[PDB]
Amino acid sequence: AWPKVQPEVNIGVVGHVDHGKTTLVQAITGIWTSKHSEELKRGMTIKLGYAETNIGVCESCKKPEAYVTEPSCKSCGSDDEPKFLRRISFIDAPGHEVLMATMLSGAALMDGAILVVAANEPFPQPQTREHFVALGIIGVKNLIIVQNKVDVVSKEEALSQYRQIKQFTKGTWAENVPIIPVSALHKINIDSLIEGIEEYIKTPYRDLSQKPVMLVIRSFDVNKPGTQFNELKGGVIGGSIIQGLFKVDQEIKVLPGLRVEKQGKVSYEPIFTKISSIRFGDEEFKEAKPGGLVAIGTYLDPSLTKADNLLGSIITLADAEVPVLWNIRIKYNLLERVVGAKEMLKVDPIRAKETLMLSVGSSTTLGIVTSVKKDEIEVELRRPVAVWSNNIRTVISRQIAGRWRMIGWGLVEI
Numbered sequence: 256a257w258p259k260v261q262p263e264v265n266i267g268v269v270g271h272v273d274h275g276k277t278t279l280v281q282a283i284t285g286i287w288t289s290k291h292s293e294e295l296k297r298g299m300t301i302k303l304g305y306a307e308t309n310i311g312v313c314e315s316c317k318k319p320e321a322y323v324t325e326p327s328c329k330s331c332g333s334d335d336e337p338k339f340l341r342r343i344s345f346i347d348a349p350g351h352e353v354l355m356a357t358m359l360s361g362a363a364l365m366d367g368a369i370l371v372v373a374a375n376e377p378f379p380q381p382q383t384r385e386h387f388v389a390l391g392i393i394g395v396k397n398l399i400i401v402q403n404k405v406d407v408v409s410k411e412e413a414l415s416q417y418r419q420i421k422q423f424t425k426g427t428w429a430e431n432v433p434i435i436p437v438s439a440l441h442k443i444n445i446d447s448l449i450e451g452i453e454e455y456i457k458t459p460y461r462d463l464s465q466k467p468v469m470l471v472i473r474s475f476d477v478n479k480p481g482t483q484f485n486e487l488k489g490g491v492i493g494g495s496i497i498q499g500l501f502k503v504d505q506e507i508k509v510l511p512g513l514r515v516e517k518q519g520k521v522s523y524e525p526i527f528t529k530i531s532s533i534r535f536g537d538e539e540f541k542e543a544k545p546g547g548l549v550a551i552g553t554y555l556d557p558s559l560t561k562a563d564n565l566l567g568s569i570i571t572l573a574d575a576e577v578p579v580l581w582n583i584r585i586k587y588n589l590l591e592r593v594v595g596a597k598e599m600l601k602v603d604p605i606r607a608k609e610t611l612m613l614s615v616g617s618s619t620t621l622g623i624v625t626s627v628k629k630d631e632i633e634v635e636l637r638r639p640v641a642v643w644s645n646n647i648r649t650v651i652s653r654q655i656a657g658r659w660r661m662i663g664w665g666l667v668e669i
């Protein structure tokens with residue numbers, strides 16, 4: 256007997272156009288976004304790739320083949336049941352991680368990361384090296400480099416890459432980074448991969464009783480044409496619990512909440528409505544919590560949720576220490592080189608009265624720095640961020656040419 260629990264952790268998977276994308280998660284999980292997702296999504300447009308999978312490790316068997324994903328501990332000559340472990344969730348970027356459409360949404364979700372790089376591809380790959388950059392900028396705790404396409408080339412050439420990876424990871428934040436040989440469209444050493452996922456990207460440490468905070472990443476009016484008024488419920492909220500515990504029947508609010516349309520000015524009056532329900536993937540749960548992705552039932556006017564309206568917001572408890580600021584101050588230390596198309600450019604330090612792009616967890620606001628110092632500056636954002644911890648991390652971007660590109664990171668000071 257294996258218990259049905261909500262995901263408990265969250266791992267993102269990125270890399271160049273190097274294969275397999277969704278295929279690797281699929282090689283670990285099953286059916287999900289973004290073409291179907293059942294029984295979850297009844298249609299959609301673009302967005303990210305989400306899939307959670309059970310993970311159990313079999314005691315009777317031998318490492319690493321002892322690692323399983325379902326209760327069928329067959330391939331070890333024993334009828335014994337595994338020891339139920341974790342409920343890992345996987346999220347990936349179908350083409351929005353970096354360089355295009357920066358939201359940081361899923362980026363704040365990373366309890367770890369998998370940098371996949373095809374072995375048939377010369378390392379380091381252009382786009383992949385900038386992927387490794389964001390992993391240090393957004394500071395994803397615990398990552399692993401998975402050599403894909405290992406089946407394409409000899410182990411010996413599979414080591415010509417190993418060199419280059421170790422060579423690329425000389426004196427960086429990741430020296431003990433794992434490099435896992437794995438196969439794409441085929442299932443080779445995937446279980447060993449699991450092992451590492453169970454060692455390097457370990458089950459996180461959290462505090463059961465802290466400030467419940469969820470981060471709206473999408474919202475939609477679930478009622479489709481033909482739902483009669485007598486029978487319908489307020490649109491749900493996407494997002495993910497980052498701290499604390501949420502329950503049904505529990506009163507919460509979203510910040511900054513609803514914008515105010517009056518006079519010649521504009522503000523934001525936070526929206527107060529309760530949690531109708533919880534539901535992780537297929538099943539409908541009872542007490543939302545960190546790890547994995549969730550969707551919350553509500554009493555809002557669906558007009559408010561429809562079309563990912565609230566996304567980039569933040570769900571917090573009915574009443575709490577929830578500073579919403581039209582001006583922020585962040586310590587920092589930016590980079591010196593910006594990579595991308597063609598070759599890396601020379602990026603100057605933050606300029607005064609300049610408009611930068613600030614991504615705070617689930618949000619991405621453009622603000623103007625109203626005073627610069629060495630380790631710190633103040634930014635006049637156009638949309639009120641909803642700070643909550645002196646430790647929160649913001650990603651700064653500057654529009655060099657057409658759009659914005661990551662240039663540094665810093666903590667919000669309050």
Ligand SMILES: Nc1nc2c(ncn2[C@@H]2O[C@H](COP(=O)(O)OP(=O)(O)CP(=O)(O)O)[C@@H](O)[C@H]2O)c(=O)[nH]1
Pocket residue numbers: 295296297298299300475476477478479491532533534535536549550551552
């Ligand atoms: N977790 C959870 N999600 C719910 C619940 N009720 C409705 N939903 C959400 O409603 C969605 C149903 O999809 P759909 O009604 O077609 O809206 P949509 O995904 O925006 C599709 P379209 O873009 O065509 O309008 C699911 O993805 C699910 O997240 C619930 O009680 N719990």
